[PDB]
Structure 1
Amino acid sequence: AEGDDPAKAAFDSLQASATEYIGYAWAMVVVIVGATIGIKLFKKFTSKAS
């Protein structure tokens, strides 16, 4: 009980922080996927011309 209270709260803080990192992950992949969408579009142009 008493001992595990501060620890439970600590785990909550750790979980929230994990969520912050995870948000950054979603974003990073937003850039990479953005790059893939654009570049694959270049390829699309090329094929249409072909």
Structure 2
Amino acid sequence: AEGDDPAKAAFNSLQASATEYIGYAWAMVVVIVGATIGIKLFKKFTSKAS
């Protein structure tokens, strides 16, 4: 019974896929923010150096 439901196999597969793509989502936005705010901070440097 338990574990024999194809729906559960599909669900778990989608859970794995979601987890992966969440890793992608965080990985991507971390790269985006890293560069974006990094440059912003460099812009703040030029302000502080004024």
CA spacing shift, 1:44–1:3, aligned 2, 3 Å: closer
CA-based RMSD of the aligned residues comes to: 2.2
Identity of aligned residues (%): 98
Q: 1:28 Cα deviation (Å)? A: 0.2
TM-score normalised by L of structure 1: 0.78
Structure (1/2) with the larger helix percentage: 1
Q: Take 1:31 and 1:40, find their aligned partners in 2: how far apart are those partners?
A: 14
Runs of 4+ displaced beyond 2 Å: 1-4
Q: 1:2 Cα deviation (Å)? A: 8.7
Q: 1:14 Cα deviation (Å)? A: 1.1
TM-score normalised by L of structure 2: 0.78
